[PDB]
């Protein structure tokens, strides 16, 4: 049976009269996500994520009460196999090519600044602080996993280069100022298009969210859209000091290794190969 057939009692309750075979299921690290016209049903793919799901719901409720200039997935129903129904944010990612037009780029950079300002402000609220993960030593944990799990896969020069990147990383301040999305790639930012210029519809995939350093989200933006665009965002939002530029560079240079560390634990061979390009 499919995931759709297997989960069908719950689906007829949550989506009365909706043909399950007409839906689509996207997968992630922790959650099978059933995609309906205006909402998704999140289901745990492990015993670990089934236990964490209440807390994830609580977090999503906090995010739904922030002022970010856009939508987030709003919790519509939670239950116990636990499920969490979230609103589906409409729109699609922005193709990097759209940023060729300088009027589009200005408007898009403007909406990114609003979101990042909202996340920054939100991190100063004791309540959000109280509800959201704020790990200490998030990078020393990373560096140890890389040495343990990735170095054995790497050339001698790979290990040397990675060692340099991890050093830089150990020299960063353990800043916990902002709400940090943690994975703010292009595919996680949806837009309304074809109604004048692009308008930020909303942001999805908040599983990596934390109180942290916003340089992590800015680095992700630059990785998706390039340096001219990130310079535009940094200048519009007043974030183009050299200390910020250092944190951004340090974090970005970990992106290949983060992908490789995930693909290692996944059994994903293509992501691991891509991640390790130049480290072997």
């Amino acid at each position: 049976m499919g995931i759709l057939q297997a989960n069908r009692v719950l689906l007829s309750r949550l989506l009365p009269g909706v043909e399950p075979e007409g839906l689509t299921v996207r997968h992630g690290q922790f959650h099978q996500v059933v995609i309906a016209s205006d909402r998704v049903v999140c289901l745990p793919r492990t015993a670990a994520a089934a236990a964490r799901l209440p807390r994830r719901a609580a977090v999503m409720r906090v995010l739904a009460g922030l002022d970010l200039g856009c939508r987030t997935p709003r919790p519509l129903c939670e239950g116990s196999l636990p499920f969490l129904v979230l609103s589906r944010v409409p729109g699609a990612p922005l193709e990097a090519d759209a940023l060729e037009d300088s009027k589009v780029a200005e408007v898009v950079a403007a909406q990114y600044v609003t979101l990042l300002s909202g996340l920054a402000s939100a991190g100063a609220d004791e309540k959000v602080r109280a509800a959201l993960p704020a790990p200490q030593g998030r990078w020393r944990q990373f560096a140890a996993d890389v040495r343990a799990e990735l170095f054995p896969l790497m050339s001698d020069g790979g290990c040397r280069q990675a060692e340099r990147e991890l050093a830089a990383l150990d020299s960063l301040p353990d800043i916990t100022e902002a709400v940090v999305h943690g994975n703010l790639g292009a595919e996680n930012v949806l837009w309304v298009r074809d109604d004048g210029l692009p308008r930020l519809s909303g942001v999805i995939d908040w599983d990596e969210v934390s109180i942290g350093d916003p340089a992590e989200d800015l680095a992700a933006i630059g990785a998706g859209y390039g340096k001219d665009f990130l310079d535009q965002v940094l200048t519009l939002g007043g974030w183009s000091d050299r200390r910020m530029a250092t944190r951004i560079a340090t974090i970005r240079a970990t992106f290949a290794l983060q992908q490789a560390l995930s693909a290692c634990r996944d059994g994903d061979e293509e992501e691991l190969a891509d991640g390790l390009t130049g480290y072997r």
Binding site: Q29, G182, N183, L184, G185, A186, D207, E208, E216, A219, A220, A223, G224, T254, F255, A256, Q258, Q259, S262, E271
Partner: peptide, 6 residues
């Protein structure tokens, strides 16, 4: 927690 290079 950057996936796929972000």
């Amino acid at each position: 927690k950057a996936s796929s290079x972000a």
